[PDB]
């Protein structure tokens, strides 16, 4: 009896073993072990958790306790001394479009979500944490350094609440603390449809037999849909501009409105589901609502899987791609498809790819208006700019014509995210995503940098000179040493991202290994992987591999000129072709004949 028992945050259902459709919760994917990969279960552990008291307290909680003999540096100090920079000039990725960054966030949200602990609204807890900066229970504050300008301007700390854990929610005492993944581990478009039956149903248009998703009724985009507004007040979206009073959107995932470009991608996907569903109603007039919904949903999930694995991963892993993700051999029921705890930190390499501004372009791809280029921080939880400032068409063009930020050892995360992050729960544009990531690593009980190097079969630097050789950077390796005093204590998020990029990729050795294993596993352990014989017919497969993000844009926006390879850097007008030159998805293979 391994630690086999606990199972509390989870459901009630039966499995229909011959259903051709995925469940909403992920349950029933694996036949021998039904709960594998399902939502609201613990993140898998590739290595034992490392807590200060061996079970739940994070390192840095008890100032008198050390980690391998040394105090762990304050998250915000590492942020200031290492992660920050002032000059945005020369920081853009010359061969990756803004879409490269945006797709990563989409894939990250489809796979993992560890929500913070709630326990109390009409509670002085939210007060005692933000107002007095008192560590205790789920309040684990990010204290400011001496000499930090936020001390003079914001307070003594940044509130931070520990992530939820399986089993309960109130105090737990025996086995080690395991964080929750609130979404399904399979790449299945759960960010569009939801991971709970509760929300999946609410997102659907059930008053009509067409299998469509509910759309906004207050607002339209030149005859195209917007996601419906969300029903919870107070909403962070109307707070950022109490005059416009425009709420956040309602999507399969709760993070949809964190930033305008993410909300934009969610809208494109919502539209494709409806486009697909009314297009299927046309070929199969007899199919009912449920059939239309499931069938369009199945297609959309295949689309996300194809673009991710054919177009996105090859340019993230580069030459390491083949090393971790060999060609598909078919479904393997012995593979654990669960997303690991460390993956949720390794996938955060994307934060260093976010630029400081977002632009809106007009039909010739020229600046759209007088204030076309805006600072990223004014777009956090901003939905009013979409509904009241031109729709998504100007934003989508920016995604195609602008570049991502390139990871740079001297310029890691932009100040828009490092000093001005807005949290849905608080009211200042003054948080630090980098310090939060570091703090969260400790909160999740992550092993140090060298434990992961070993796990991936990579050398493990013990000295400064050793760290210089791995990082190939003398001064970085030595800021790192002055703060951490041993490479063993380096938090994985900063350690992984500090490594030089592999050839043709955008991450280093350690990250390539961690990312590559995870993706190989969610592909091989998915009974509904699009290439698995029997999921789709041979003819449906020939049709599916013609999808492209470019075509998705053409069919769901009023944009008529798009690049052929949307993820690489493309210059207008030279790299842009006419939408009619672009491959469509041929849905005829989905036509049925029941007589
Ligand atoms: C403007 C762009 C982005 C913003 C503003 C943003 C913001 C955030 C915030 C606030 C968190 C919660 C952190 C915590 O409490 O621990 C988070 C988590 C995360 N982000 Fe980002 N993010 C952005 C882009 C990206 C991109 C491009 C990727 C990948 C390519 C990515 C991957 C992740 C992952 C994996 C998590 C942890 C998710 C979980 O499992 O709970 N993010 N982000
Ligand atoms: C900017 O990035 C581009 C995409 O990453 C890159 O083009 C890619 O170059 C690789 C070189 O390995 C080629 O990869 C493809 O090679 C053949 C196609 O001829 C296929 O059999 C392989 O499976 C593989 O997909 C491609 O030619 C191309 N990749 C794609 C997806 O189009 C550019 O070279 C980069 N531009 C600059 C200036 O560096
Ligand atoms: C909060 O949202 C407000 C409304 O969405 C926004 O004000 C709006 O934006 C500007 C005001 O600065 C005006 O837009 C422009 O409209 C035409 C372009 O078609 C121009 O010819 C006008 O001169 C004008 O500049 C809108 O009139 C204005 N709308 C309202 C109702 O005031 C605020 O700027 C937002 N406030 C913040 C702090 O973000
Ligand atoms: C659910 O679907 C119905 C029908 O497709 C939507 O209503 C139609 O679409 C628009 C807006 O209402 C108009 O063309 C007609 O008024 C409707 N036609 C029919 C035949 O009803 C409705 O908007 C959808 N509801 C939600 C919440 O998305
Ligand atoms: C299905 O996946 C399993 C688990 O990943 C694979 O297991 C391999 O088999 C060896 C022994 O034969 C195990 O020690 C390892 O777990 C795996 N090999 C290596 C090199 O790590 C298994 O090979 C897969 N089965 C099929 C039929 O492909
Ligand atoms: O944008 C986010 N993640 O990419 C995000 C936003 C708010 C809360 C948690 C999150 O992970
Ligand atoms: Ca999923």
Curated annotation (Swiss-Prot):
**Tissue expression summary:** Mammary gland; milk.
Judging by the UniProt lineage, the source's domain of life is Eukaryota
Mutation: residue 108 to E; reported impact is: Partially bound heme and decrease in activity. Loss of heme binding and activity
Record PTM Phosphoserine, positions in chain: 198
Q: Which top EC class is named for this enzyme in its record?
A: oxidoreductase
Q: Does the keyword Iron apply?
A: yes
Write down the position(s) of the site called Transition state stabilizer: 255
Q: Where is the active site?
A: 109 (proton acceptor)
As its record notes, the protein acts as a catalyst of: 2 a phenolic donor + H2O2 = 2 a phenolic radical donor + 2 H2O; thiocyanate + H2O2 + H(+) = hypothiocyanous acid + H2O; iodide + H2O2 = hypoiodite + H2O
- Cysteines engaged in disulfide bonds, as pairs: 6-167, 15-28, 129-139, 133-157, 237-248, 456-513, 554-579
Q: Where in the cell is it found?
A: Secreted; Cytoplasm
Q: Which residues bind heme b?
A: 108, 258, 351
Q: Which cofactor does it need?
A: Ca(2+); heme b
- Is Cytoplasm there in the keyword field? yes
Taken from the UniProt entry, a GO cellular component term is: cytoplasm
What are the 3'-nitrotyrosine sites (modified residues) in this protein?
A: 365
What other note does the entry give for this protein? Thiocyanate (SCN(-)) and hypothiocyanite (OSCN(-)) are bound in the distal heme cavity. The iodide ion (I(-)) occupies a position which is stabilized by the interactions with heme moiety, His-109, Arg-255 and Glu-258. Hydrogen peroxide is held between the heme iron and His-109.
Q: Name the chain's protein.
A: Lactoperoxidase
Part of the full-length chain shown: 118 to 712 of 712
């Amino acid at each position: 009896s391994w630690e086999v028992g606990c199972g509390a945050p989870v459901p009630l259902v039966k499995c229909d073993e011959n259903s051709p459709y995925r469940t909403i919760t992920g349950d029933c994917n694996n036949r021998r072990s039904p709960a594998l990969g399902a939502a609201n279960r613990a993140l898998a552990r590739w290595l034992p958790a490392e807590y200060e008291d061996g079970l739940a307290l994070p390192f840095g909680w008890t100032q008198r306790k050390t980690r391998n003999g040394f105090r762990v540096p304050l998250a915000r100090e590492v942020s200031n001394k290492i992660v920050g920079y002032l000059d945005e000039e020369g920081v853009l990725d010359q061969n990756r479009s803004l879409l490269f960054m945006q797709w990563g966030q989409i894939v990250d949200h489809d796979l993992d979500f560890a929500p913070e602990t709630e326990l109390g609204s009409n509670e002085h807890s939210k007060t005692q944490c933000e107002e007095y900066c008192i560590q205790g229970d789920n309040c684990f504050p990010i204290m400011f350094p001496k000499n930090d300008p936020k001390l003079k301007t914001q307070g003594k700390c940044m509130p931070f609440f520990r992530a939820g854990f399986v089993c309960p929610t109130p105090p737990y005492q025996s086995l080690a603390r395991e964080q929750i993944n609130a979404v399904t581990s399979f790449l299945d478009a759960s960010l569009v449809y939801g991971s709970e039956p509760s929300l999946a149903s609410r997102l659907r248009n059930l008053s009509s037999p067409l299998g469509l998703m509910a759309v906004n009724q207050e607002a339209w985009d030149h005859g195209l849909a917007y996601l419906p507004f969300n029903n919870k007040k107070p909403s962070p979206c109307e707070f950022i501009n109490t005059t416009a009073r425009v709420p956040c959107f309602l999507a399969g995932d709760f993070r949809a409105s964190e930033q305008i470009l993410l909300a934009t991608a969610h809208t494109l996907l919502l539209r494709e589901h409806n486009r697909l569903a009314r297009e299927l109603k046309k070929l199969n007039p007899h199919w009912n609502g449920e059939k239309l919904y499931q069938e369009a949903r199945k297609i959309l999930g295949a689309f996300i899987q194809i673009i991710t694995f054919r177009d996105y991963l090859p340019i993230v892993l580069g030459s390491e791609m083949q090393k971790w993700i060999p060609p598909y051999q078919g479904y393997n029921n012995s593979v654990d498809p669960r997303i690991s705890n460390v993956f949720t930190f390794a996938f955060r390499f994307g934060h260093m790819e976010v630029p400081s501004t977002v632009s809106r372009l007009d039909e010739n791809y020229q600046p759209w208006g007088p204030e076309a280029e805006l600072p990223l921080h004014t777009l956090f939880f901003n939905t009013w700019r979409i509904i009241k400032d031109g729709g998504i068409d100007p934003l989508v063009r920016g995604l195609l014509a602008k570049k991502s930020k390139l990871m740079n050892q001297d310029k890691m995360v932009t100040s828009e995210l490092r000093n001005k992050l807005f949290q849905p729960t608080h009211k200042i544009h003054g948080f630090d995503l980098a310090a939060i990531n570091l703090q969260r690593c400790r909160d999740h009980g992550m092993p140090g940098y060298n434990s992961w190097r070993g796990f991936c079969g990579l050398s493990q630097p013990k000295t400064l000179k050793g760290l210089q050789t791995v990082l190939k950077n003398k001064i970085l390796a030595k800021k790192l040493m002055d703060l951490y005093k041993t490479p063993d204590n380096i938090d994985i998020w900063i350690g992984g991202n500090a490594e030089p990029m592999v050839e043709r990729g955008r991450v280093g050795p350690l990250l390539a290994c961690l990312l590559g294993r995870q993706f190989q596993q969610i592909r091989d352990g998915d009974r509904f992987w699009w290439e698995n014989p029997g999921v789709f017919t041979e003819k449906q497969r020939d049709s599916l591999q013609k999808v492209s993000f470019s075509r998705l844009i053409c069919d769901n926006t009023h944009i008529t000129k798009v690049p052929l390879h949307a993820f690489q850097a493309n210059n207008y007008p030279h790299d842009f072709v006419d939408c009619s030159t672009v491959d469509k998805l041929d849905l005829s293979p989905w036509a049925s004949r029941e007589n």
